[PDB]
Amino acid sequence: REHWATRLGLILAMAGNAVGLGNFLRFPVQAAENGGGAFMIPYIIAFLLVGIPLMWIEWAMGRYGGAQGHGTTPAIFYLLWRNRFAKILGVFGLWIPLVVAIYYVYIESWTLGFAIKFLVGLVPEPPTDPDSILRPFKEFLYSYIGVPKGDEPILKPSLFAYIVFLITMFINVSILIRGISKGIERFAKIAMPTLFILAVFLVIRVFLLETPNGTAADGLNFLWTPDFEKLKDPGVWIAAVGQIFATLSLGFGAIITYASYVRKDQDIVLSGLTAATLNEKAEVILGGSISIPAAVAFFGVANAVAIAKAGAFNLGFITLPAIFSQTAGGTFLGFLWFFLLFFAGLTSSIAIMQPMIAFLEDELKLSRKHAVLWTAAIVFFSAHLVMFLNKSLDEMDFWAGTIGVVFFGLTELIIFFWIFGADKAWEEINRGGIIKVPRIYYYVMRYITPAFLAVLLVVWAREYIPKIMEETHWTVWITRFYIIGLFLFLTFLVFLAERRRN
Ligand SMILES: CCCCCCCCCCC
Ligand SMILES: CC(C)C[C@H](N)C(=O)O
Ligand code: NA
Ligand code: NA
C-alpha cells in the first residue's frame, strides 16, 4: 500500500482536505444568518461533541482498513462487521464524495475563472448607490454561470466557464495522478502555506476597511458577541452541526481514505487533532474575518446579514468583489480572494475524488492512472447535469452534502463503536498515539454523539418527508433519478469487486 512520506505532509494534506470553500464561503453565511455570536456557542459545542470524536473515529477506521489494503467504507465496514448490508451501507462512502465532487469541482472552477478574469482585469466597472455597485457584479456572475432572467430550469454557461471547468479537471487529475506522496502531499506542502499567507493578508487588508457606514471591527464584534436568545432555536444548532460536518469533511469518506495511507504504527490522535484545529483556525479566525467584516464595513450589520441571507454565492462572488472595486487596487485584491478560494477548493476536491480512485485501486485492482482517469471522466460527465440544470446543484448538495453526511456519520460511528465493539474501537483509536484521547470522549463517542445525530436525523426527516413528494420543478426529479443511478452503479461495482475476491 502507498503511504504518506512525512508526518508534516500528512498533516498539511488532511488540513487541505478540511480547509476549503466551506471556510470562506459557507461559514460566513451560516454565522451571519444565525446571529453571528449566537451561532458560535453551538458551533463550538458541535465541534467538541461531534467534530473531534468523528474525526478521530474516521482516522482510526481509515488506518485500520488501510493496514489490510482497503481505503474505502465498502470493504472497511465489512472488516468491522461481517455482512453484505455493511457493504451496501459502505456504498455511501463513495456515493457521497462522488456526488459532492460533481458540483464542488464546478464551484472551484468558478473561483478559478474569476481568479483569471480578475487578474487580467476583465471585470465590471462600477461608478454611491449600493444596488447599483452590486448590479454589474451580479450580471457578471449570472453571465458567467448562465443564470436565467426569471426562474427557468435551463442554465446557459459561457464557453469560458466550460473551458475553465475542463482546465480545473485537468489540474485535479494532474495532482491526483502522481499519487499520495508525490501528488497530494507535495501539492499540500505548497498550497497550504500559500493559502494561509493569502488568508492572513486578506484578513489584515479587510480589517483596515472603514467607512461612514461601518467598519470591519464592527463585523468582528457582531461575529464574536454572544447571544443567548438564539440558544432555544433548534435551527441554530442544526446549522452548527451541519457546518461542522461540512467543514471537517466528516461523513464524506474522505478522511477515512486519506487515513488508509497512514502506516499502521503511526499516530492518528495528535495528527487528527492538529488537522481539525488548523481547520477551525482557518474557519473562525480567517474565514470569519474577511467576508462579513467587509460587508458590515461597507453596508453595515443589518445589510450584511440581509446579503448573507440572500444566498451563499452572493456574498463571495458578488458582494465582496463589488466592495473591493471601491478600493484602490480592488481588482487585484479580488484576484487574491478568488485565488485563495481556488487553492482551498482544489485541496478539498482532490480529497473528495480520492475515495473513488482508491476504491478502483484496492477493490478492482486498477492502476492509479486508470483509476484517476476514469474517476475524472465520471465526475466530468456527471457535471453537465450541474452545469445546465438549475436547482440541480442544490439538490445534490442537499441529498449528499447535508443529509447523507450526517446519516453516514451516524452509520460509521454505530458500526465502529457499537457493533465492532467500544473497547476495541477505543484501543484502536489510541494505539500508536503520540497523545492519548481524554477518557471522557469514550463516553462521548458511545452515547452522546450517536444520540445527537439520531435526534437530528429524526427532526430532519420529520420536516422534509412531506416536502419531498410535493415539489414542482422537474430538474430536481432528473437530478434525484441520476444520483440514484449513480448509487446503483457504485453498488454494482462493489458487487463486481466482491465477485472478483471469490
Ligand atoms: C515547500 C515550501 C512552500 C512555500 C510556499 C510559499 C508561497 C508564498 C505565497 C505568497 C502569497
Ligand atoms: C466536502 C469537503 C471536502 C468540504 C471541505 N471540508 C470544506 O470545508 O470545504
Ligand atoms: Na473546512
Ligand atoms: Na481544501
Residues whose CB falls within 8 Å of the CB of residue 261, separated by 6 or more in sequence, listed in order: 1, 2, 3, 4, 66, 71, 180
Provide the CB-side half-sphere exposure for 76 (13 A, CA). 35
Which residue in the block uniquely carries the three cell numbers 480520492?
354
Give the pocket of ligand 1 (CB within 6 Å). Answer: 189-190, 193-194, 197-198
CB of 271 within 8 A of CB of 4? Answer: no
CB of 272 within 8 A of CB of 14? Answer: yes
Give the pocket of ligand 2 (CB within 6 Å). Answer: 18, 20-23, 100, 246-247, 249, 252, 254, 348, 351-352
CA of 213 to the centre of ligand 2 (A): 34
Of 453, 452, 456, 474, nearest in space to 464 by CA: 456
The CA-atom distances, in angstroms, between 255 and each of 109, 224, 272, 446 are 23, 30, 9, 20
CA of 233 to the centre of ligand 4 (A): 31
Grid coordinates standing for 62?
Answer: 481509515
Torsion region of 277: left, alpha or beta (phi above 0 gives left; psi -120 to 50 gives alpha):
alpha
CA of 194 to the centre of ligand 1 (A): 5
Name the closest ligand to CA 348: 4
Residues whose CB falls within 8 Å of the CB of residue 386, separated by 6 or more in sequence, listed in order: 102, 103, 106, 392, 393, 396
Atom from ligand 2 closest to the CA of residue 20: 9
Give Cα 304 distance to the centre of its chain. 24
Backbone angles phi, psi at 160, to 5 degrees: -60, -40
Name the closest ligand to CA 8: 1
Backbone angles phi, psi at 389, to 5 degrees: -110, 115
How deeply is 157 buried, as exposed, middle or buried, from its count of CB atoms within 10 A (0-12, 13-18, 19+)?
buried
Atom from ligand 2 closest to the CA of residue 97: 1
CB of 69 within 8 A of CB of 373? Answer: no
Backbone angles phi, psi at 238, to 5 degrees: -60, -45
Which residue type is seen at 317? F
Residues whose CB falls within 8 Å of the CB of residue 323, separated by 6 or more in sequence, listed in order: 209, 294, 295, 297, 298, 330
Secondary structure letter of residue 438 according to DSSP? P
DSSP bridge pairs for 235: none
DSSP-based three-state secondary structure for 411: helix
The CA-atom distances, in angstroms, between 83 and each of 77, 88, 384, 407, 424 are 9, 9, 36, 19, 19
DSSP-based three-state secondary structure for 21: helix
- Give the chain's radius of gyration (CA, Å): 22
Experimental technique: X-ray
* Residue nearest to ligand 1 atom 9, measured at CA: 194
How deeply is 47 buried, as exposed, middle or buried, from its count of CB atoms within 10 A (0-12, 13-18, 19+)?
buried
How deeply is 126 buried, as exposed, middle or buried, from its count of CB atoms within 10 A (0-12, 13-18, 19+)?
middle
Alpha carbon distance 178, 200 (integer Å): 30
How deeply is 143 buried, as exposed, middle or buried, from its count of CB atoms within 10 A (0-12, 13-18, 19+)?
middle
The residue to mutate among 185, 190, 202, having the most atoms of ligand 1 within 8 angstroms of its beta carbon, is 190
Name the closest ligand to CA 185: 1
Grid coordinates standing for 403?
Answer: 443529509
Atom from ligand 1 closest to the CA of residue 189: 1
Give a three-class secondary structure readout of 105-133: HHHHHHHHHHHHHHHHCCCCCCCCCHHHH
Secondary structure letter of residue 312 according to DSSP? S
CB of 390 within 8 A of CB of 154? Answer: yes
CB of 292 within 8 A of CB of 316? Answer: no
Of 171, 162, 174, 168, nearest in space to 384 by CA: 162
Which residue type is seen at 349? S
Alpha carbon distance 394, 99 (integer Å): 12
Alpha carbon distance 155, 392 (integer Å): 10
Alpha carbon distance 345, 25 (integer Å): 11
Which residue in the block uniquely carries the three cell numbers 487529475?
173
CB of 356 within 8 A of CB of 368? Answer: no
Provide the CB-side half-sphere exposure for 416 (13 A, CA). 31
DSSP-based three-state secondary structure for 6: coil
Name the closest ligand to CA 275: 3
Residues whose CB falls within 8 Å of the CB of residue 90, separated by 6 or more in sequence, listed in order: 72, 73, 74, 75, 76, 77, 78, 494
For 409, the enclosing helix (H) or strand (E) is helix 405-414
CA of 12 to the centre of ligand 1 (A): 13
Please measure the distance between the N-terminal and C-terminal CA atoms of the chain and give it in whole angstroms. 21
Which residue type is seen at 323? I
Q: For the chain, give every domain's residue range.
A: 1-502
CA of 346 to the centre of ligand 3 (A): 12
> Dihedral angle at the C-alpha atoms of 188, 397, 88, 429, nearest 10 degrees?
40
For 318, the enclosing helix (H) or strand (E) is none
CA of 133 to the centre of ligand 2 (A): 31
CB of 493 within 8 A of CB of 365? Answer: no
Atom from ligand 2 closest to the CA of residue 283: 8
CA of 25 to the centre of ligand 4 (A): 12
Alpha carbon distance 370, 93 (integer Å): 20
Q: Are strands 214-215 and 210-211 parallel, antiparallel or unpaired?
A: antiparallel
Specify the resolution in Å.
Answer: 2.6
Give Cα 297 distance to the centre of its chain. 28
CB of 183 within 8 A of CB of 257? Answer: no
Alpha carbon distance 68, 300 (integer Å): 56
Which residue type is seen at 54? L
CB of 392 within 8 A of CB of 385? Answer: yes
Which residue in the block uniquely carries the three cell numbers 469533511?
249
Alpha carbon distance 381, 51 (integer Å): 33
Binding-site residue set for phosphocholine = 84
> Dihedral angle at the C-alpha atoms of 33, 37, 41, 44, nearest 10 degrees?
80
> Dihedral angle at the C-alpha atoms of 417, 420, 426, 431, nearest 10 degrees?
-140
Percent helix, percent strand, percent coil in the chain, to nearest 5: 80, 0, 20
Secondary structure letter of residue 436 according to DSSP? P
Secondary structure letter of residue 1 according to DSSP? -
* Residue nearest to ligand 1 atom 5, measured at CA: 190
Atom from ligand 2 closest to the CA of residue 104: 1
CB of 247 within 8 A of CB of 283? Answer: yes
Pairs from 491-500 (Cβ < 8 Å, separation ≥ 24): 491/88, 491/91, 493/359, 493/363, 493/364, 494/74, 494/87, 494/88, 494/90, 494/91, 494/363, 496/364, 497/74, 497/75, 497/359, 497/363, 497/364, 498/87, 500/363, 500/364, 500/365
Alpha carbon distance 115, 471 (integer Å): 36
* Residue nearest to ligand 2 atom 3, measured at CA: 348
Atom from ligand 1 closest to the CA of residue 198: 11
Residues whose CB falls within 8 Å of the CB of residue 453, separated by 6 or more in sequence, listed in order: 50, 406, 409, 410, 413
CB of 13 within 8 A of CB of 206? Answer: no
How deeply is 101 buried, as exposed, middle or buried, from its count of CB atoms within 10 A (0-12, 13-18, 19+)?
buried
Give a three-class secondary structure readout of 243-263: HHHHHCCCCCCHHHHHHCCCC
Can you spell out the DSSP letters for 142-180? HHHHT--SSS-SB----HHHHHHHHHHHHHHHHHHTT-I
Grid coordinates standing for 398?
Answer: 442537499
Q: Which residues surround ligand 3, an ion (CB under 5 A)?
A: 18, 22-23, 247, 279
Grid coordinates standing for 157?
Answer: 454557461
Grid coordinates standing for 210?
Answer: 472603514
CA of 243 to the centre of ligand 3 (A): 9
Secondary structure letter of residue 331 according to DSSP? H
Grid coordinates standing for 457?
Answer: 436525523
CB of 233 within 8 A of CB of 25? Answer: no
Binding-site residue set = 84
Alpha carbon distance 57, 268 (integer Å): 10
Give Cα 272 distance to the centre of its chain. 17
Residues whose CB falls within 8 Å of the CB of residue 414, separated by 6 or more in sequence, listed in order: 450
Alpha carbon distance 271, 434 (integer Å): 9
